Amino acid sequence: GAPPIMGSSVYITVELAIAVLAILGNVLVCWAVWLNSNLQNVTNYFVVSLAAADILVGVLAIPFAITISTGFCAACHGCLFIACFVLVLAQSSIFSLLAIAIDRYIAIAIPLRYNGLVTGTRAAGIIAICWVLSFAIGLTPMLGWNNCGQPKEGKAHSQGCGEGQVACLFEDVVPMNYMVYFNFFACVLVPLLLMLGVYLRIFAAARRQLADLEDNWETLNDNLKVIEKADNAAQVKDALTKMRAAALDAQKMKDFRHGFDILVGQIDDALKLANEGKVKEAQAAAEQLKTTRNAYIQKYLERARSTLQKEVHAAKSAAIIAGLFALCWLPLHIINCFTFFCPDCSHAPLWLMYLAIVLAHTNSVVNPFIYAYRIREFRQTFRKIIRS
Ligand SMILES: CC(C)CCC[C@@H](C)[C@H]1CC[C@H]2[C@@H]3CC=C4C[C@@H](O)CC[C@]4(C)[C@H]3CC[C@]12C
Ligand SMILES: CC(C)CCC[C@@H](C)[C@H]1CC[C@H]2[C@@H]3CC=C4C[C@@H](O)CC[C@]4(C)[C@H]3CC[C@]12C
Ligand SMILES: CC(C)CCC[C@@H](C)[C@H]1CC[C@H]2[C@@H]3CC=C4C[C@@H](O)CC[C@]4(C)[C@H]3CC[C@]12C
Ligand SMILES: CCCCCCCC/C=C/CCCCCCCC(=O)OCC(O)CO
Ligand SMILES: CCCCCCCC/C=C\CCCCCCCC(=O)OCC(O)CO
Ligand SMILES: Cc1cc(-c2nnc(N)nc2-c2ccc(F)cc2)cc(Cl)n1
Ligand SMILES: CCCCCCCC/C=C\CCCCCCCC(=O)O
Ligand SMILES: CCCCCCCC/C=C\CCCCCCCC(=O)O
Ligand code: NA
């Protein structure tokens, strides 16, 4: 049995390196949002809340984790707090991630009423509520759901602990049924699955709207060919009526409105000629629609397409951060499931526990890099902060 301080040294050194990185990177995130007005929106307010949680991981949770690794003597409820505080930060992260997903869904599903529904004031209140709920959920063991009533007295005595004191170890004070059923299944897995559902609805909404834009564009060009090859005024009329409906459907801001004002008007002119039985005159009038199409309508099509592709890209960036949270925290939770559900299985080795802990902590480092590589406004703001 090699000296415990050696393996501890590696684990502690790595934890400290992660702490420094988690603090520096996320302070940079908060600083960027503070300085740049272009980054000051509801979505990034939840980003800041998420960054704040990761800063507290470096400042508090990792020092707590280092202290716990020693198994030092402590009052059981004191040990409980140290042990549970990371649950608060993880829970807060989950709420922030869920809020970001919902915010992006609202932005893509109902953009016309997004600004009136999703404000900074309401977002601030939501963030406040979610932090309170995170403390409630994370510190639930301090409300009585703990193992302090049945301390490991043999372990405490061997370490020379005083009366009322226990060897401070996570699994000795935090019940595994809490960790598996309440924390993991209810408070982590269900919100993550809800998140997945939201992002599925986001991407499906994007795909449908991009399809609708193309269908309108196709309806516009197809009916133009119909009018040109028509032989009677009735055929011209039917094609124009479908165009007028498609034009108004695509219409649903000054150069934009004027472009469609021309289009609908030109359709009405051709429609009037069509209802008079003047086929040739109707077709010639309908030919003018191509000029409006190339000068105005096509420009609106590409810009609308460009805006949706940007929303898709932004939603993907947010989903990546959500996925990374899951990837980093799932090993710890899975290990707890094995410990809990399979008492006939040997406990996961200490080195693997340390690795799972380090991995969870690394998640507090990765987000600033995702923002830098995927979000131009962040990356450019980061450069300005660092250079100056
Ligand atoms: C505002 C921020 C910076 C304050 C941080 C306060 C932290 C460091 C304090 C608050 C409560 C404290 C714990 C309260 C009770 C005990 C029981 C004792 O037997 C060992 C120490 C221990 C486990 C303390 C460790 C440090 C602790 C977690
Ligand atoms: C989320 C992604 C990365 C998947 C994570 C899978 C990891 C967490 C899984 C895969 C295989 C698993 C191990 C398979 C077998 C055992 C032996 C048992 O006596 C204790 C648990 C232990 C040691 C498991 C711990 C968790 C484990 C390491
Ligand atoms: C987010 C997605 C991946 C769902 C999470 C899957 C989790 C809940 C699954 C994946 C693998 C599962 C484990 C696989 C094998 C065993 C060994 C058995 O003796 C007891 C149950 C136990 C320990 C399972 C518990 C639940 C488990 C950890
Ligand atoms: C916009 C900024 C957001 C900032 C807003 C953040 C507010 C966080 C404070 C929570 C205190 C309430 C937590 C309640 C959970 C109770 C469990 C508990 O405290 O028990 C410990 C104990 O004394 C057993 O001895
Ligand atoms: C600028 C940011 C603000 C600063 C944020 C604060 C940083 C907290 C640091 C360490 C927490 C570790 C505390 C635990 C130390 C306990 C060891 C101990 O108590 O040992 C006595 C004992 O009874 C065993 O015998
Ligand atoms: C101080 C500490 C303890 C644990 C820990 N140590 N042992 C066991 N069995 N589970 C957990 C743990 C697992 C999932 C979770 F969300 C929080 C803590 C994990 C982290 Cl990141 N920090
Ligand atoms: C920016 C402020 C951050 C605060 C710095 C914290 C750094 C210290 C890290 C870990 C302290 C661990 C204390 C070890 C517990 C005592 C071991 C024992 O009693 O056997
Ligand atoms: C750990 C379980 C937590 C228990 C939750 C029950 C208490 C919180 C319930 C609802 C929080 C809703 C916050 C609403 C604030 C009012 C906003 C307003 O006045 O406009
Ligand atoms: Na986090």
Coordinates of C-alpha atoms and ligand atoms in Angstrom, one line a residue:
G1 CA 0.0 0.0 0.0
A2 CA 1.8 3.1 -1.3
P3 CA 1.7 6.3 0.8
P4 CA -1.7 7.9 0.5
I5 CA -0.1 11.4 0.2
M6 CA 1.4 10.4 -3.2
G7 CA -1.8 9.5 -5.0
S8 CA -3.4 12.4 -3.1
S9 CA -0.7 14.7 -4.5
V10 CA -1.6 13.9 -8.1
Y11 CA -5.3 14.3 -7.5
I12 CA -4.9 17.5 -5.6
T13 CA -2.5 19.1 -8.1
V14 CA -4.9 18.3 -11.0
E15 CA -7.9 19.7 -9.0
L16 CA -6.0 22.9 -8.4
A17 CA -5.1 23.2 -12.0
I18 CA -8.7 22.8 -13.0
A19 CA -9.8 25.4 -10.4
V20 CA -7.5 28.0 -11.8
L21 CA -8.7 27.4 -15.3
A22 CA -12.4 27.3 -14.3
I23 CA -12.1 30.7 -12.6
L24 CA -10.1 32.4 -15.3
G25 CA -12.2 31.2 -18.2
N26 CA -15.5 32.0 -16.7
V27 CA -14.5 35.4 -15.2
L28 CA -13.7 36.2 -18.9
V29 CA -17.2 35.1 -19.9
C30 CA -18.8 37.4 -17.3
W31 CA -16.5 40.2 -18.2
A32 CA -17.4 39.9 -21.9
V33 CA -21.1 40.1 -21.2
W34 CA -20.6 43.1 -18.9
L35 CA -18.5 45.1 -21.4
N36 CA -20.3 44.3 -24.7
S37 CA -23.9 45.5 -25.2
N38 CA -24.3 43.1 -28.1
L39 CA -23.8 40.2 -25.7
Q40 CA -26.4 41.6 -23.2
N41 CA -29.5 39.5 -23.9
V42 CA -31.7 37.0 -21.9
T43 CA -29.8 34.0 -23.3
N44 CA -26.5 35.3 -22.2
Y45 CA -27.9 36.2 -18.7
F46 CA -28.3 32.4 -18.2
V47 CA -24.9 31.9 -19.6
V48 CA -23.5 34.3 -16.9
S49 CA -25.5 32.4 -14.2
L50 CA -23.9 29.2 -15.6
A51 CA -20.4 30.9 -15.6
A52 CA -21.0 32.0 -12.0
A53 CA -21.7 28.4 -11.0
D54 CA -18.5 27.3 -12.6
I55 CA -16.5 30.1 -10.9
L56 CA -17.9 28.8 -7.6
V57 CA -16.7 25.3 -8.6
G58 CA -13.2 26.6 -8.7
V59 CA -13.4 28.8 -5.6
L60 CA -15.4 26.5 -3.3
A61 CA -16.4 23.1 -4.7
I62 CA -12.9 22.0 -5.6
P63 CA -11.3 23.1 -2.3
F64 CA -14.2 21.3 -0.6
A65 CA -13.5 18.2 -2.8
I66 CA -9.8 18.4 -1.8
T67 CA -10.7 18.6 1.9
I68 CA -13.1 15.6 1.6
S69 CA -10.4 13.5 0.0
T70 CA -8.5 13.6 3.3
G71 CA -11.3 12.1 5.3
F72 CA -10.6 14.6 8.1
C73 CA -12.6 14.6 11.4
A74 CA -15.6 16.8 11.4
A75 CA -19.0 17.4 12.8
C76 CA -21.3 15.3 10.7
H77 CA -23.6 18.2 9.5
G78 CA -20.5 20.3 8.8
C79 CA -19.2 17.4 6.7
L80 CA -22.6 17.2 5.1
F81 CA -22.5 20.8 3.9
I82 CA -19.0 20.5 2.4
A83 CA -20.2 17.3 0.6
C84 CA -23.5 18.7 -0.7
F85 CA -22.5 22.1 -1.9
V86 CA -21.4 20.8 -5.3
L87 CA -24.9 19.4 -5.7
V88 CA -26.2 23.0 -5.5
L89 CA -23.8 24.2 -8.2
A90 CA -24.6 21.2 -10.5
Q91 CA -28.4 21.8 -10.0
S92 CA -28.0 25.5 -10.8
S93 CA -26.1 24.5 -14.0
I94 CA -29.0 22.2 -15.0
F95 CA -31.6 24.9 -14.5
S96 CA -29.5 27.4 -16.5
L97 CA -29.1 24.9 -19.3
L98 CA -32.8 24.1 -19.4
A99 CA -33.6 27.8 -19.4
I100 CA -31.3 28.4 -22.4
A101 CA -32.9 25.7 -24.3
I102 CA -36.4 27.0 -23.6
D103 CA -35.3 30.6 -24.5
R104 CA -34.0 29.4 -27.9
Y105 CA -37.2 27.5 -28.5
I106 CA -39.4 30.6 -27.8
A107 CA -37.1 32.6 -30.2
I108 CA -37.6 30.1 -33.0
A109 CA -41.2 29.1 -32.5
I110 CA -42.7 32.5 -31.7
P111 CA -40.2 35.2 -32.7
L112 CA -42.9 37.8 -33.2
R113 CA -43.7 37.8 -29.5
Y114 CA -40.4 36.8 -28.1
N115 CA -39.4 40.4 -27.0
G116 CA -42.7 40.9 -25.2
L117 CA -42.5 37.5 -23.4
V118 CA -38.9 37.1 -22.6
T119 CA -37.4 40.1 -20.9
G120 CA -34.2 40.8 -18.8
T121 CA -36.3 41.6 -15.7
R122 CA -38.2 38.3 -15.9
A123 CA -35.0 36.5 -16.6
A124 CA -33.3 38.0 -13.5
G125 CA -36.2 36.8 -11.4
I126 CA -36.1 33.3 -12.9
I127 CA -32.3 33.1 -12.2
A128 CA -32.9 34.1 -8.6
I129 CA -35.6 31.5 -8.2
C130 CA -33.5 28.8 -9.8
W131 CA -30.6 29.5 -7.4
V132 CA -32.9 29.3 -4.4
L133 CA -34.3 26.0 -5.7
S134 CA -30.7 24.7 -6.3
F135 CA -29.8 25.3 -2.7
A136 CA -33.0 23.6 -1.6
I137 CA -32.4 20.5 -3.8
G138 CA -28.7 20.3 -3.2
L139 CA -28.9 20.8 0.6
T140 CA -31.9 18.5 1.0
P141 CA -29.6 16.0 2.9
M142 CA -29.1 18.7 5.6
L143 CA -32.9 18.6 6.2
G144 CA -32.6 15.1 7.6
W145 CA -32.1 12.8 4.6
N146 CA -28.6 11.8 5.8
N147 CA -26.6 9.1 7.6
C148 CA -25.5 11.3 10.5
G149 CA -27.9 9.4 12.8
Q150 CA -25.9 6.2 12.2
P151 CA -22.2 7.2 12.1
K152 CA -19.3 4.9 11.4
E153 CA -17.9 4.9 14.9
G154 CA -15.2 2.4 14.2
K155 CA -13.8 4.6 11.4
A156 CA -14.1 7.7 13.5
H157 CA -12.3 6.1 16.5
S158 CA -9.5 4.8 14.3
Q159 CA -8.8 8.4 13.0
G160 CA -9.0 9.7 16.6
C161 CA -12.1 11.8 16.0
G162 CA -13.8 13.6 18.9
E163 CA -17.4 13.1 20.1
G164 CA -20.0 13.9 17.6
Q165 CA -17.4 13.8 14.9
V166 CA -17.1 11.5 11.9
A167 CA -14.5 10.8 9.2
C168 CA -15.7 13.2 6.5
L169 CA -16.4 11.0 3.5
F170 CA -19.1 11.7 0.9
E171 CA -20.6 8.2 0.8
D172 CA -20.6 7.9 4.6
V173 CA -22.8 10.9 5.2
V174 CA -24.8 11.3 1.9
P175 CA -27.4 8.5 1.4
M176 CA -27.0 6.6 -1.8
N177 CA -30.8 6.4 -2.3
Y178 CA -30.9 10.2 -2.3
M179 CA -28.0 10.3 -4.8
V180 CA -29.6 7.8 -7.2
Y181 CA -33.4 8.3 -6.9
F182 CA -33.7 12.0 -5.9
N183 CA -30.6 13.7 -7.2
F184 CA -29.8 11.6 -10.4
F185 CA -33.1 10.3 -11.6
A186 CA -35.4 13.1 -10.6
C187 CA -33.2 16.2 -10.5
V188 CA -30.6 15.4 -13.2
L189 CA -31.9 12.8 -15.7
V190 CA -35.4 14.2 -16.1
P191 CA -34.3 17.8 -16.7
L192 CA -31.7 16.5 -19.2
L193 CA -34.3 14.4 -21.0
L194 CA -36.6 17.4 -21.1
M195 CA -33.7 19.4 -22.5
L196 CA -33.3 16.8 -25.2
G197 CA -37.0 17.1 -26.0
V198 CA -36.8 20.9 -26.3
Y199 CA -33.8 20.8 -28.7
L200 CA -35.6 18.2 -30.8
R201 CA -38.5 20.5 -31.1
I202 CA -36.2 23.4 -31.9
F203 CA -34.5 21.7 -34.8
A204 CA -37.8 20.3 -36.1
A205 CA -39.2 23.8 -36.0
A206 CA -36.2 25.1 -37.9
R207 CA -36.5 22.4 -40.6
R208 CA -40.2 23.1 -41.0
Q209 CA -39.7 26.8 -41.4
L210 CA -36.9 26.4 -43.9
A211 CA -39.2 24.0 -45.8
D212 CA -42.0 26.5 -45.8
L213 CA -39.8 29.2 -47.2
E214 CA -38.7 26.9 -50.1
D215 CA -42.3 25.8 -50.7
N216 CA -43.5 29.4 -51.0
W217 CA -40.6 30.2 -53.3
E218 CA -41.4 27.2 -55.5
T219 CA -45.1 28.0 -55.6
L220 CA -44.2 31.5 -56.8
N221 CA -42.0 30.2 -59.7
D222 CA -44.2 27.3 -60.6
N223 CA -47.4 29.4 -61.0
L224 CA -45.5 31.9 -63.2
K225 CA -44.8 29.0 -65.6
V226 CA -48.4 28.1 -65.5
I227 CA -49.6 31.6 -66.5
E228 CA -47.2 31.8 -69.4
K229 CA -48.4 28.5 -70.8
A230 CA -52.1 29.1 -70.1
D231 CA -54.6 29.3 -72.9
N232 CA -57.6 30.9 -71.2
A233 CA -58.3 33.6 -68.6
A234 CA -59.6 31.1 -66.1
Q235 CA -56.3 29.3 -65.9
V236 CA -54.5 32.6 -65.4
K237 CA -56.9 33.5 -62.6
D238 CA -56.4 30.2 -60.7
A239 CA -52.7 30.5 -60.8
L240 CA -52.8 34.1 -59.7
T241 CA -55.1 33.4 -56.7
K242 CA -52.6 30.8 -55.5
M243 CA -49.8 33.3 -55.9
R244 CA -51.7 36.0 -54.0
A245 CA -52.2 33.7 -51.1
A246 CA -48.5 32.5 -51.2
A247 CA -47.4 36.1 -51.3
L248 CA -49.3 37.1 -48.2
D249 CA -48.3 33.9 -46.5
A250 CA -44.6 34.7 -47.2
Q251 CA -45.2 38.3 -46.1
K252 CA -46.1 37.1 -42.6
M253 CA -39.0 46.3 -42.8
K254 CA -39.6 49.3 -45.1
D255 CA -37.9 47.9 -48.2
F256 CA -39.4 44.5 -47.3
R257 CA -43.0 45.8 -47.2
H258 CA -42.5 47.9 -50.3
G259 CA -41.3 44.8 -52.2
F260 CA -44.3 42.8 -51.2
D261 CA -46.6 45.8 -51.8
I262 CA -45.4 45.8 -55.4
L263 CA -45.8 42.0 -55.7
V264 CA -49.4 41.8 -54.4
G265 CA -50.4 44.9 -56.4
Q266 CA -49.0 43.4 -59.6
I267 CA -50.9 40.2 -58.9
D268 CA -54.1 42.2 -58.4
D269 CA -53.5 44.0 -61.7
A270 CA -53.1 40.7 -63.6
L271 CA -56.1 39.3 -61.7
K272 CA -58.3 42.2 -62.8
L273 CA -57.2 41.6 -66.4
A274 CA -57.9 37.9 -66.0
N275 CA -61.4 38.5 -64.7
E276 CA -62.1 40.6 -67.8
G277 CA -61.1 37.7 -70.1
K278 CA -58.0 39.6 -71.3
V279 CA -55.6 36.6 -71.3
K280 CA -52.7 38.1 -73.3
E281 CA -52.9 41.3 -71.3
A282 CA -53.0 39.3 -68.0
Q283 CA -49.9 37.2 -69.0
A284 CA -47.9 40.3 -70.0
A285 CA -48.8 41.9 -66.6
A286 CA -47.8 38.7 -64.8
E287 CA -44.4 38.8 -66.6
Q288 CA -43.6 42.0 -64.6
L289 CA -43.7 39.9 -61.5
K290 CA -40.3 38.4 -62.4
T291 CA -38.7 41.9 -62.1
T292 CA -40.1 42.3 -58.6
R293 CA -39.1 38.7 -57.7
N294 CA -35.4 39.3 -58.7
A295 CA -35.2 42.7 -57.1
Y296 CA -37.0 42.2 -53.8
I297 CA -38.5 38.8 -53.1
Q298 CA -35.4 36.7 -53.7
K299 CA -33.5 39.0 -51.3
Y300 CA -36.0 38.4 -48.6
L301 CA -35.8 34.7 -49.2
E302 CA -32.1 34.5 -48.7
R303 CA -32.1 36.8 -45.7
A304 CA -34.9 34.8 -44.0
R305 CA -33.0 31.6 -44.8
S306 CA -29.8 33.2 -43.4
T307 CA -31.5 34.1 -40.2
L308 CA -32.8 30.6 -39.6
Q309 CA -29.5 29.0 -40.3
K310 CA -28.0 31.3 -37.6
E311 CA -30.6 30.3 -35.1
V312 CA -29.9 26.6 -35.9
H313 CA -26.2 27.3 -35.4
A314 CA -26.8 29.1 -32.1
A315 CA -29.1 26.3 -31.0
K316 CA -26.4 23.7 -31.8
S317 CA -23.8 25.6 -29.8
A318 CA -26.2 25.6 -26.8
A319 CA -26.9 21.9 -27.2
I320 CA -23.2 21.1 -27.3
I321 CA -22.7 22.7 -23.9
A322 CA -25.7 20.8 -22.6
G323 CA -24.3 17.6 -24.0
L324 CA -20.9 18.2 -22.5
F325 CA -22.5 18.7 -19.1
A326 CA -24.1 15.3 -19.5
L327 CA -20.9 13.6 -20.7
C328 CA -18.9 15.0 -17.8
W329 CA -21.3 14.2 -15.0
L330 CA -22.8 10.9 -16.1
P331 CA -19.9 8.7 -15.1
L332 CA -20.2 9.8 -11.4
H333 CA -23.9 9.1 -11.5
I334 CA -23.5 5.7 -13.2
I335 CA -20.9 4.7 -10.7
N336 CA -23.4 5.5 -7.9
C337 CA -26.0 3.4 -9.7
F338 CA -23.6 0.4 -9.6
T339 CA -22.8 1.0 -5.9
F340 CA -26.5 1.3 -5.1
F341 CA -28.1 -1.3 -7.3
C342 CA -25.4 -3.9 -7.2
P343 CA -24.1 -4.6 -3.6
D344 CA -22.7 -7.9 -4.8
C345 CA -20.4 -6.0 -7.1
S346 CA -17.0 -4.7 -5.8
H347 CA -17.0 -0.9 -5.2
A348 CA -15.5 1.2 -8.0
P349 CA -11.8 1.6 -7.2
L350 CA -10.6 4.9 -5.6
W351 CA -8.6 5.9 -8.6
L352 CA -11.7 5.7 -10.8
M353 CA -13.7 7.8 -8.3
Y354 CA -11.0 10.5 -8.5
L355 CA -11.1 10.3 -12.3
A356 CA -14.8 10.7 -12.3
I357 CA -14.6 13.6 -10.0
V358 CA -11.9 15.4 -12.0
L359 CA -13.9 14.8 -15.2
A360 CA -17.0 16.4 -13.6
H361 CA -14.9 19.4 -12.6
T362 CA -13.4 19.8 -16.1
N363 CA -16.8 20.7 -17.3
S364 CA -16.4 24.0 -15.5
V365 CA -13.5 24.7 -17.8
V366 CA -14.9 23.8 -21.2
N367 CA -17.8 26.3 -21.8
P368 CA -15.6 29.4 -22.4
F369 CA -13.8 27.5 -25.2
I370 CA -17.2 26.6 -26.8
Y371 CA -18.2 30.2 -26.8
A372 CA -14.8 31.3 -28.3
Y373 CA -14.9 28.7 -31.1
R374 CA -18.6 29.0 -32.0
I375 CA -19.7 32.5 -31.2
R376 CA -18.0 35.4 -33.1
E377 CA -19.2 38.2 -30.7
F378 CA -17.7 36.4 -27.7
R379 CA -14.5 35.5 -29.5
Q380 CA -14.0 39.1 -30.7
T381 CA -14.8 40.4 -27.2
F382 CA -12.4 38.0 -25.6
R383 CA -9.6 39.2 -27.9
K384 CA -10.3 42.8 -27.0
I385 CA -10.2 42.0 -23.3
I386 CA -6.9 40.0 -23.5
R387 CA -5.1 42.4 -25.8
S388 CA -6.0 45.6 -23.9
Ligands
LIG1 C1 -18.6 33.6 1.6 C2 -17.7 32.4 1.5 C3 -16.4 32.7 1.0 C4 -17.7 31.7 2.9 C5 -17.2 30.2 2.9 C6 -17.5 29.5 4.2 C7 -17.0 28.0 4.3 C8 -15.6 27.9 3.8 C9 -17.3 27.5 5.6 C10 -18.8 27.7 6.0 C11 -19.3 26.5 6.9 C12 -17.9 25.8 7.2 C13 -18.1 24.4 7.8 C14 -19.0 24.5 9.0 C15 -18.7 23.3 10.0 C16 -17.7 22.5 9.9 C17 -17.6 21.4 11.0 C18 -16.2 21.3 11.6 O1 -16.1 20.2 12.5 C19 -15.1 21.2 10.5 C20 -15.2 22.3 9.5 C21 -16.6 22.5 8.8 C22 -16.9 21.4 7.8 C23 -16.6 23.9 8.2 C24 -15.7 24.1 7.0 C25 -15.7 25.4 6.3 C26 -17.1 26.0 6.0 C27 -17.7 25.2 4.8
LIG2 C1 -20.9 8.8 -20.1 C2 -20.0 7.9 -20.9 C3 -18.6 8.4 -20.9 C4 -20.1 6.4 -20.4 C5 -19.5 6.2 -19.0 C6 -19.4 4.7 -18.7 C7 -18.6 4.4 -17.4 C8 -19.0 5.4 -16.4 C9 -18.9 2.9 -17.0 C10 -18.5 1.9 -18.1 C11 -18.1 0.6 -17.4 C12 -18.4 0.8 -16.0 C13 -17.7 -0.1 -15.0 C14 -18.0 -1.5 -15.4 C15 -17.7 -2.5 -14.2 C16 -17.5 -2.1 -12.9 C17 -17.2 -3.2 -11.9 C18 -18.0 -3.0 -10.6 O1 -17.5 -3.9 -9.6 C19 -18.0 -1.6 -10.1 C20 -18.4 -0.5 -11.2 C21 -17.6 -0.7 -12.5 C22 -16.1 -0.2 -12.2 C23 -18.2 0.2 -13.6 C24 -18.2 1.7 -13.3 C25 -18.8 2.6 -14.4 C26 -18.2 2.3 -15.7 C27 -16.7 2.7 -15.7
LIG3 C1 -28.6 9.3 -19.8 C2 -28.8 7.9 -20.4 C3 -27.5 7.3 -20.7 C4 -29.6 7.0 -19.3 C5 -28.8 6.7 -18.1 C6 -28.5 5.1 -18.0 C7 -28.3 4.6 -16.6 C8 -29.5 5.0 -15.7 C9 -28.1 3.0 -16.7 C10 -27.1 2.7 -17.7 C11 -26.3 1.4 -17.3 C12 -27.2 0.9 -16.1 C13 -26.5 -0.1 -15.1 C14 -26.1 -1.2 -16.0 C15 -25.8 -2.5 -15.1 C16 -26.2 -2.6 -13.8 C17 -25.8 -3.8 -13.0 C18 -27.0 -4.4 -12.2 O1 -26.5 -5.4 -11.4 C19 -27.7 -3.4 -11.4 C20 -28.1 -2.1 -12.3 C21 -27.0 -1.5 -13.1 C22 -26.0 -0.8 -12.1 C23 -27.6 -0.5 -14.1 C24 -28.2 0.7 -13.4 C25 -28.7 1.8 -14.4 C26 -27.7 2.2 -15.4 C27 -26.5 3.0 -14.7
LIG4 C1 -29.7 37.3 -9.5 C2 -28.8 36.8 -8.4 C3 -29.2 35.5 -7.8 C4 -28.9 35.4 -6.3 C5 -29.9 34.6 -5.4 C6 -29.2 33.5 -4.6 C7 -29.8 33.2 -3.3 C8 -29.2 31.9 -2.7 C9 -29.6 31.7 -1.2 C10 -30.2 30.7 -0.7 C11 -30.6 30.6 0.7 C12 -31.8 29.6 0.8 C13 -31.5 28.2 0.7 C14 -32.4 27.2 1.4 C15 -32.0 25.8 1.5 C16 -32.1 25.4 2.9 C17 -31.2 24.2 3.4 C18 -30.3 24.8 4.5 O1 -29.9 25.9 4.5 O2 -29.8 24.1 5.6 C19 -28.5 24.4 6.2 C20 -28.6 24.2 7.7 O3 -28.5 25.3 8.6 C21 -28.7 22.9 8.4 O4 -28.0 23.2 9.5
LIG5 C1 -11.9 35.1 -2.9 C2 -13.0 34.1 -2.7 C3 -13.5 33.9 -1.3 C4 -12.8 32.7 -0.6 C5 -13.6 31.4 -0.5 C6 -13.1 30.5 0.7 C7 -12.1 29.4 0.2 C8 -12.4 28.2 1.1 C9 -11.2 27.3 1.2 C10 -11.1 26.1 1.7 C11 -12.3 25.4 2.3 C12 -11.9 24.3 3.1 C13 -12.4 24.3 4.6 C14 -12.2 23.0 5.3 C15 -11.0 22.9 6.2 C16 -11.3 22.0 7.3 C17 -10.1 21.2 8.0 C18 -10.4 21.1 9.4 O1 -11.4 21.7 9.9 O2 -9.6 20.4 10.4 C19 -9.9 20.5 11.8 C20 -10.5 19.2 12.2 O3 -11.4 19.0 13.2 C21 -10.0 17.9 11.6 O4 -9.3 17.4 12.7
LIG6 C1 -16.8 16.6 -3.1 C2 -17.3 15.8 -4.3 C3 -17.9 14.4 -4.1 C4 -18.4 13.7 -5.2 C5 -18.9 12.3 -5.1 N1 -18.1 11.4 -4.3 N2 -18.6 10.1 -4.1 C6 -19.8 9.6 -4.7 N3 -20.2 8.3 -4.5 N4 -20.6 10.5 -5.4 C7 -20.2 11.8 -5.7 C8 -21.1 12.7 -6.5 C9 -21.7 12.0 -7.7 C10 -22.7 12.9 -8.6 C11 -22.9 14.3 -8.2 F1 -23.7 15.0 -9.0 C12 -22.3 14.9 -7.0 C13 -21.4 14.1 -6.1 C14 -18.3 14.3 -6.6 C15 -17.8 15.7 -6.7 CL1 -17.7 16.4 -8.3 N5 -17.3 16.4 -5.6
LIG7 C1 -9.7 32.6 -4.7 C2 -10.0 32.1 -3.3 C3 -10.0 30.5 -3.2 C4 -9.6 29.9 -1.9 C5 -8.3 29.1 -1.9 C6 -8.5 27.7 -1.4 C7 -7.3 26.8 -1.7 C8 -7.0 25.7 -0.6 C9 -7.4 24.3 -1.1 C10 -7.7 23.3 -0.3 C11 -7.7 23.4 1.2 C12 -7.8 21.9 1.8 C13 -7.6 21.8 3.3 C14 -7.2 20.4 3.7 C15 -8.0 19.8 4.8 C16 -7.1 19.5 6.0 C17 -6.5 18.1 6.0 C18 -6.6 17.4 7.3 O1 -7.0 18.0 8.3 O2 -6.2 16.2 7.5
LIG8 C1 -36.8 20.8 -2.9 C2 -38.2 21.1 -3.3 C3 -38.5 22.5 -3.5 C4 -40.0 23.0 -3.1 C5 -40.6 24.0 -4.1 C6 -41.9 24.7 -3.5 C7 -41.7 26.2 -3.3 C8 -41.4 27.0 -4.5 C9 -42.6 27.0 -5.4 C10 -42.7 27.9 -6.5 C11 -41.7 29.0 -6.9 C12 -42.4 30.0 -7.8 C13 -41.8 31.4 -7.7 C14 -42.9 32.5 -8.0 C15 -42.5 33.8 -7.5 C16 -43.6 34.9 -7.8 C17 -43.3 35.8 -9.0 C18 -44.3 37.0 -9.1 O1 -44.7 37.5 -8.0 O2 -44.6 37.5 -10.2
NA9 NA -21.5 23.8 -14.3

